[PDB]
Write a protein that holds these residues in place. Structure first.
Motif, PDB file in Angstrom:
ATOM      1  N   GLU A 187      18.521   7.839 -12.369  1.00  0.00           N
ATOM      2  CA  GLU A 187      19.743   7.818 -11.552  1.00  0.00           C
ATOM      3  C   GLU A 187      21.014   8.288 -12.277  1.00  0.00           C
ATOM      4  O   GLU A 187      21.990   8.657 -11.628  1.00  0.00           O
TER       5      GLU A 187
ATOM      6  N   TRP B 135      10.581   4.634  -6.338  1.00  0.00           N
ATOM      7  CA  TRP B 135      11.108   4.141  -5.049  1.00  0.00           C
ATOM      8  C   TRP B 135      11.716   5.241  -4.227  1.00  0.00           C
ATOM      9  O   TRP B 135      12.297   6.164  -4.786  1.00  0.00           O
TER      10      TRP B 135
ATOM     11  N   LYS C 255      14.399   5.516  -2.664  1.00  0.00           N
ATOM     12  CA  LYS C 255      15.812   5.752  -3.008  1.00  0.00           C
ATOM     13  C   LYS C 255      15.975   6.853  -4.057  1.00  0.00           C
ATOM     14  O   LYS C 255      17.040   7.466  -4.170  1.00  0.00           O
TER      15      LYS C 255
ATOM     16  N   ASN D 255      11.138   1.155  -0.866  1.00  0.00           N
ATOM     17  CA  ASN D 255      12.089   0.367  -1.672  1.00  0.00           C
ATOM     18  C   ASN D 255      11.732  -1.126  -1.677  1.00  0.00           C
ATOM     19  O   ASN D 255      11.359  -1.692  -0.649  1.00  0.00           O
TER      20      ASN D 255
END
Ligand SMILES: [Mg+2]
Ligand SMILES: [Mg+2]
Lengths: 221, 228
Positions: A106, A138, A140, A165
């Motif tokens: 991320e 996940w 996301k 998720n």
């Protein structure tokens, strides 16, 4: 508890699933892992042989025009390398907190492509076999994953499947659920490649190929 | 007939150990030096075998085994307890074609197969734990006498059963071994472990954790066990 006086012997043990459930790479094996993965180029040679074997098998299949012919790919340490991350944390010898690798992903951190697997991916498309990438990341992380794939030249797939998720499923059970849903939709799975035996449970059709990974272990059945 | 190119022998060997490479007919001709080096010179074979037998033993030590249950461990014979190396060393370390029956004929004449000490240590340690070894071999029954002599010669004596293949049987090794293991299950035995140098030895259609000893010399065709 168990000493591993010879690091090559430990590594063979893990590749063959003679040694399972290790939380970390043995401390005395740090230099072996670094040299295997980078300096010696043995990781590259091992990877190339696996991908070449998969390709010679793939190009001998007589594919029918009336079904969807697919090849399953794992993502992390199959198409994309976590080596830069592990390199900072002692090449698997140190404990890492769960979620940390994802946070790293991320943060804007790209992963290098694994070119031997990328060559296989491109070859399969040329043969008309449709890659399905199944990842434990996940959902996301979809946007960041797609970006990283694009950066390594991967932009076409039949499906890219990520994990719901906050799913409570183990990696081995989640991937088995996905493969079984693929069979159920009528897809013909001809092969499956991944760096963990967990990716390669023989519960659905197709020949399996185990890419090397000395860094870490994902529990299986 | 069709050659296959393997410019790195170590990568080839890892491929065969993992079953990424299967059913090879002979060792790649360029890998002769590598195999001889792996098995003898470098001692890597020894260190690899030690590691495998050690995991097996530490696994066995950790089992809660009932006294009233017949708890067994399956051993393969050739290249698990007794080594075919002196034979293959005569034929380019697996890089040359050998007639089928040639190995069995070589055994029949009373040639020595040296013990594999790391497996022998495991065998001895399992006896101490009260686990009863069963040796399943693809050797024909007619080799029973030379087999028992070579086992005794390397310090193996107490087995529950030593099971050889019916003379002239047309079963493949994988199918024959599966039939034996399944009959052991039917007998009410509790298979807690299985060790052998070929995946064919280790099909998980009967119970017990499997351990794969290294063998770069040859490949025995195998079969995959369908999970649910
Ligand atoms: Mg992976
Ligand atoms: Mg054997």
């Amino acid at each position: 508890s168990i000493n591993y006086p010879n690091c090559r012997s430990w590594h063979l043990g893990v590749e063959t699933s003679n040694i399972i459930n290790f939380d970390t790479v043995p401390a005395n094996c740090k230099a072996y892992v670094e040299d295997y993965l980078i300096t010696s180029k043995q990781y590259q040679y091992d990877s190339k042989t696996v991908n070449k074997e998969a390709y010679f098998y793939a190009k001998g299949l007589a594919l029918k025009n009336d079904t969807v012919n697919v090849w399953i790919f794992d993502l992390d340490d199959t198409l994309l390398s976590s080596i830069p991350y592990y390199a900072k944390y002692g090449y698997g010898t140190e404990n890492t907190a769960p979620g940390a690798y994802w946070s790293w992903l991320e943060s804007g951190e790209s992963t290098p492509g694994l070119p031997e697997t990328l060559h296989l991916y491109e070859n399969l498309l040329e043969l008309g076999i449709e890659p399905i990438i199944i990842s434990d990341r996940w959902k996301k992380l979809s946007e960041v994953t797609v970006e990283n794939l694009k950066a390594v030249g991967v932009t076409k797939w039949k499906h890219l499947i990520l994990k719901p998720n906050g799913s409570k499923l183990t990696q081995v059970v989640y991937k088995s659920k996905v493969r079984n849903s693929l069979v159920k939709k009528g897809y013909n799975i001809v092969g499956n490649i991944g760096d963990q035996w967990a990716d390669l449970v023989e519960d659905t059709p197709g020949r399996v190929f185990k890419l090397p990974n000395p860094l870490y272990y994902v529990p299986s059945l």
